[PDB]
Symmetry: C2
Subunit: 159 residues, 2 copies
């Protein structure tokens, strides 16, 4: 019957690449949660409240998508949310290794959670939050890579 | 609201899902079975699409491959086995599939798989490629390796369903 997917990340901030991933996932699963990590070990530019607020606005037009923060073991959060699917976007070869390791651990922690991988669209294949930030920090144009609400908020953070 | 719209795929919630899982499956292994079982748990329907005329001559012919796979996957109600002699995208279009299952074992392959996904996106924009990691148990097995091991009497009973094991032993004198 139901499929319920979690798409975890720091989303600092959410980019068009993330939006593409979640849009695609929301087309194939009944429900999707954008799970925003509360306390990443590297301090984010936006806090959880801001990240969640931005992502909510950017994803409001998707009816089966909900944005939430989480500060617990993803397996525990997935169990709490009665999620059975874990979405991960796969951009680089470097990321694949780490995500395969994590998937094997999550299989150990939650055997009933299936990890599922999406490639980013060609359009968004080179963008990351980190890269957009670094470009923007030195006044590079990133209007093409962010939704308007995120773009405005980023500009404010850097002024 | 049919008088007004037939509806669209994206931005309107969840849609009916029909996945193709293509390969040569020469023969199908427990690794493949794991992948398709997992896909069949999350998609409404799944087709195991067995390539008829692969570039490297297979040990089993299409009829044998299809027969073996059918038997090994009969316990999954939403899975069907078919042969195809086309691009995976043309078969997908023919079957009105909207999902393409791809197994992701090696880092070496990631680049090729991303390139294939971009090509399939070009050919069939409405087809989404979805990538599954193999289970840890099956992470090192391939059809090719199991065959070569079997050819020199290595034990591969753990890597194949019984019907495939028997058929493989028959192929190897």
């Amino acid at each position: 019957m139901s499929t319920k997917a979690i798409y975890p990340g720091t989303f600092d901030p959410i980019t068009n690449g993330h939006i593409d991933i979640i849009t695609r996932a929301a087309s194939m699963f009944d429900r999707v949660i954008l799970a925003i990590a509360a306390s990443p070990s590297k301090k984010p530019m936006f806090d959880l409240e801001e990240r969640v607020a931005l992502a909510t606005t950017a994803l409001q037009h998707l009816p089966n998508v909900e944005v939430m923060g989480f500060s617990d073991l993803m397996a525990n959060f997935a169990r709490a949310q009665q999620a059975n699917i874990l979405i991960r976007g796969l951009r680089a070869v470097a990321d694949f290794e780490y995500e395969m390791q994590l998937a094997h651990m999550n299989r150990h922690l939650m055997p009933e959670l299936e990890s599922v991988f999406l490639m980013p669209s060609k359009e968004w294949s080179f963008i990351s939050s980190s890269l957009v930030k670094e470009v923007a920090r030195h006044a590079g144009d990133v209007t093409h890579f962010l939704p308007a609400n995120v773009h405005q908020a980023l500009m404010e953070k850097l002024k």
